[PDB]
Amino acid sequence: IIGGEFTTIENQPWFAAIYRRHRGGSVTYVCGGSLISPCWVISATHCFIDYPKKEDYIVYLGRSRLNSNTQGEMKFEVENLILHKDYSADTLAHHNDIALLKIRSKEGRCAQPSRTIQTIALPSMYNDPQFGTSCEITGFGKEQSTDYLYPEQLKMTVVKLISHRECQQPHYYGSEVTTKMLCAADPQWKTDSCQGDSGGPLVCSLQGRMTLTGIVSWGRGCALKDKPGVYTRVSHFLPWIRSHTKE
Amino acid sequence: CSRFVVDCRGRGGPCG
Numbered sequence: 070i071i072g073g074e075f076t077t078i079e080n081q082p083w084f085a086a087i088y089r090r091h092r093g094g095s096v097t098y099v100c101g102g103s104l105i106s107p108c109w110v111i112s113a114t115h116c117f118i119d120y121p122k123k124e125d126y127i128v129y130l131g132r133s134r135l136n137s138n139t140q141g142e143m144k145f146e147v148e149n150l151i152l153h154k155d156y157s158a159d160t161l162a163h164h165n166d167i168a169l170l171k172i173r174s175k176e177g178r179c180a181q182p183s184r185t186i187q188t189i190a191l192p193s194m195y196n197d198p199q200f201g202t203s204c205e206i207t208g209f210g211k212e213q214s215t216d217y218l219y220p221e222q223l224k225m226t227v228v229k230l231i232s233h234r235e236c237q238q239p240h241y242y243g244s245e246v247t248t249k250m251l252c253a254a255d256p257q258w259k260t261d262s263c264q265g266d267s268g269g270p271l272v273c274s275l276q277g278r279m280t281l282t283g284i285v286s287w288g289r290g291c292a293l294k295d296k297p298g299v300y301t302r303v304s305h306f307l308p309w310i311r312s313h314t315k316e
Numbered sequence: 317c318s319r320f321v322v323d324c325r326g327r328g329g330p331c332g
């Protein structure tokens with residue numbers, strides 16, 4: 070996250086920190102995700118496409134730091150890794166950039182709500198906030214696009230939803246963005262998501278409910294003028310989410 | 317680059 074503020078997991082308790090085990094036993098951060106039910110985390114396929122094996126991955130909930138344990142965290146294995154079979158990218162755009170991870174602790178349990186862990190509501194079919202709405206993003210992504218290290222404490226910021234018309238202006242992204250995506254950014258272009266924030270939530274009030282409106286997906290650079298974040302538009306993926314999370 | 321890279325296909329990343 071460029072700009073914004075250091076926060077703690079209590080303030081974004083649906084946030085999932087996803088890591089990969091390496092040959093050697095070294096563990097590195099992959100991407101963010103969001104807890105949408107006790108057993109289910111949603112993320113972005115591009116995060117996993119290179120190494121699509123569920124056994125590689127660890128999911129933490131209730132965790133506020135990147136490479137240190139925090140009180141209230143819980144650790145999970147990935148029981149099912151579901152990538153979108155129509156995932157595709159051009160030079161910049163990612164289509165169907167959506168993944169599901171079924172989580173299970175070694176003791177065979179799903180998540181339990183606590184002061185540090187809560188699910189986030191999915192929107193109803195095609196139900197999105199009006200453009201101009203202020204939403205939140207969060208993650209362990211770069212604080213500056215030129216940095217080589219990642220912040221060790223979770224960050225969040227506020228960005229505003231941009232109309233399709235405006236985002237489909239040529240000096241924005243043109244026809245790179247579809248009805249299956251949402252653009253969001255800072256009016257003054259000083260705060261944004263960045264590398265490392267992929268798969269994490271775009272969270273908006275809607276129905277007076279904190280709602281997973283988007284998943285961090287793509288953009289050109291980070292915090293560049295007329296170059297918003299592009300998010301997978303959750304309200305348009307309910308059937309995919311339904312046909313892949315049946316109990 | 318390496319297999320230890322964070323979010324290699326993310327925005328601003330090598331393959332974003």
Ligand SMILES: *Cc1cc(C*)cc(C*)c1
Pocket residue numbers: 119317318321324325330331
């Ligand atoms: C160096 C690198 C790393 C990944 C994960 C992907 C690409 C295309 C290049």
